Design a protein around this ligand. Structure first.
Ligand SMILES: O=C(O)[C@H]1O[C@H](O[C@@H]2[C@H](O)[C@@H](O)[C@@H](O[C@@H]3[C@H](O)[C@@H](O)[C@@H](O[C@@H]4[C@H](O)[C@@H](O)[C@@H](O)O[C@@H]4C(=O)O)O[C@@H]3C(=O)O)O[C@@H]2C(=O)O)[C@H](O)[C@@H](O)[C@H]1O
Ligand SMILES: [Ca+2]
Ligand SMILES: [Ca+2]
Ligand SMILES: [Ca+2]
Ligand SMILES: [Ca+2]
Length: 352
C-alpha cells in the first residue's frame, strides 16, 4: 500500500520490478543511483531504469561527533548531499539500524521517493544549502522515521547571520504532496521550509507524529497551500512554531506543545496572514498557556499570534485516512516511535 498517513501516497522503491542494493557509504549510494539509470545496454533510461530500494549501512559517527565538537567550523565547509534528481521509477533510501550520515539527501524533480531510518546530523555547509533533507519540485515524497539533528545555535559571522546550519527538511517548489512523519528532529535552528520565497506558495504537506525538541523555528515556515499537522510533540521551541504565511491554511490537530514560544503564528511578512483550525491539542484555551509554558512575543512587522487559541479560518476536508491518538498519548508514547531504530513502528490508539 501507499498509505503514508498524509498527502503523499507512495511506496517508494518497494514496488513491483524493484531492485535492492546495499550502500556502505555515500559514494556507494551515488554510484548505485547512477547505475540504476542504465538499461541492459548501458544506455540511460529517463526517470531511472527500474524501481530501487537502497539499504544504507554506512556510519559516519566520527564525522558527526567531530562536527558537534566544533559547530562553528561547519558553515564554511563544502555541503555534502546525495542528490535524487529526475528519478521517478520509485526509490527508497532506508538506513540500517546503527547507520548514520554526515551528508544529506537532496530530492529534486523526482517523485515516489521515501527516506526512512536515516540518522543525519551536524551537516557542513550551512552557508551553501547543506540540508539534511531537501524536497524540491518533488510530489509524493515520504520522509519518515529519521533522526535529523545539529545544535540549535547561531555562531557569529555567518552569511545572513543564520547559516550556522541549514535545514532538517526543506520543501520547496512543486513538491505538491509530501508527508513528513515520525522524525526526531532536535537541536535544529531552521527546521524546514514549505516554500522558499514569498512567491513559492502552494503544496499539500502533512506533518505527523514528529518529535521536535530544542528547535528554533520553521515547523514549518508555510507559504500558501495546505498543512495538516497532527500528533506531533513540540517541546522547547525557542523562536516560533508553525508559521502560516502567504494565505496558507493549516489544520493543527491533536499535538502537544510545551515550553514553546510563538507555537502557532503568522509573522515576518507583515501581510497575507494564513489561517489555522485548532482542535484536540493539549492546549485548548489561553488559560493552558501557563500550564504548558507557552509564551508569545511580537514582531516589528504586522503579525498574528494564536494567543486567543481559536481557529482563524477553515480547512478543507482531509483527503486521506488517518486516526490520531490523543495529545496525551503523544506526550506519553511518541518518543518511543519517532526517529531511528524503532523499526518504523507507528503509534495507534491501542498502544496508548
Ligand atoms: O531553500 C532554502 O534553503 C532557502 O533559504 C533561504 O530562505 C529561507 C526563508 O525562505 C527566507 O524567508 C529567509 O528567512 C528569514 C530570515 O532570513 C531568517 O534568518 C529568519 O529570520 C527570522 C526573523 O525574520 C529575523 O528578524 C530574526 O528574528 O530571526 C528569525 C528566525 O526565524 O530566526 O526567518 C525569516 C523568515 O522566516 O522569513 O531565509 C531563510 C533561510 O533559510 O535563511 C533563502 O533566502 C532562499 O533563497 C532559499 O535558499
Ligand atoms: Ca535549504
Ligand atoms: Ca536567510
Ligand atoms: Ca536556507
Ligand atoms: Ca523563520
Amino acid at each position: 500500500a501507499t498509505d503514508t498517513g498524509g498527502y503523499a501516497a507512495t511506496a517508494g522503491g518497494n514496488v513491483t520490478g524493484a531492485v535492492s542494493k546495499t550502500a556502505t557509504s555515500m559514494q556507494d549510494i551515488v554510484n548505485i543511483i547512477d547505475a540504476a539509470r542504465l538499461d541492459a545496454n548501458g544506455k540511460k533510461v529517463k526517470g531511472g531504469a527500474y524501481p530501487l530500494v537502497i539499504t544504507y549501512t554506512g556510519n559516519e559517527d566520527s564525522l558527526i561527533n567531530a562536527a558537534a565538537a566544533n559547530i562553528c567550523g561547519q558553515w564554511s565547509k563544502d555541503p555534502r548531499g546525495v542528490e535524487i534528481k529526475e528519478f521517478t521509477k520509485g526509490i527508497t533510501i532506508i538506513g540500517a539500524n546503527g547507520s548514520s550520515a554526515n551528508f544529506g539527501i537532496w530530492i529534486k524533480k523526482s517523485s515516489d521517493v521515501v527516506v526512512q531510518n536515516m540518522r543525519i546530523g551536524y551537516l557542513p555547509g550551512g552557508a551553501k544549502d547543506g540540508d539534511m533533507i531537501r524536497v524540491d519540485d518533488s510530489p509524493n515524497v515520504w520522509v519518515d522515521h529519521n533522526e535529523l539533528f545539529a545544535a540549535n545555535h547561531e555562531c557569529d559571522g555567518t552569511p545572513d547571520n543564520d547559516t550556522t546550519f541549514e535545514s532538517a527538511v526543506d520543501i520547496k517548489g512543486a513538491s505538491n504532496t509530501v508527508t513528513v512523519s515520525y522524525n526526531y528532529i532536535h537541536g535544529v535552528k531552521k527546521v524546514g521550509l514549505d516554500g522558499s520565497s514569498s512567491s513559492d506558495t502552494g503544496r499539500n504537506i502533512t506533518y505527523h507524529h514528529n518529535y521536535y525538541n530544542d528547535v528554533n523555528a520553521k515547523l514549518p515556515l508555510q507559504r500558501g497551500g495546505l498543512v495538516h499537522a497532527y500528533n506531533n510533540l513540540y517541546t522547547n521551541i525557542t523562536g516560533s512554531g508553525l508559521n502560516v504565511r502567504q494565505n496558507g491554511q493549516a489544520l493543527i490537530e491533536n499535538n502537544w506543545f510545551e515550553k514553546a514560544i510563538n507555537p502557532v503564528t503568522s509573522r515576518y511578512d507583515g501581510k497575507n496572514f494564513g489561517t489555522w483550525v485548532l482542535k484536540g491539542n493539549n492546549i485548548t484555551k489561553p488559560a493552558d498557556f501557563s500550564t504548558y509554558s507557552i509564551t508569545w512575543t511580537a514582531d516589528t512587522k504586522p503579525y498574528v499570534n494564536a494567543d486567543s487559541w481559536t481557529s482563524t479560518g477553515t480547512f478543507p476536508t482531509v483527503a486521506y485516512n488517518y486516526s490520531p491518538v490523543s495529545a496525551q498519548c503523544v506526550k506519553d508514547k511518541l518518543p518511543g516511535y519517532a526517529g531511528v531504530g524503532k523499526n518504523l513502528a507507528t503509534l495507534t490508539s491501542t498502544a496508548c
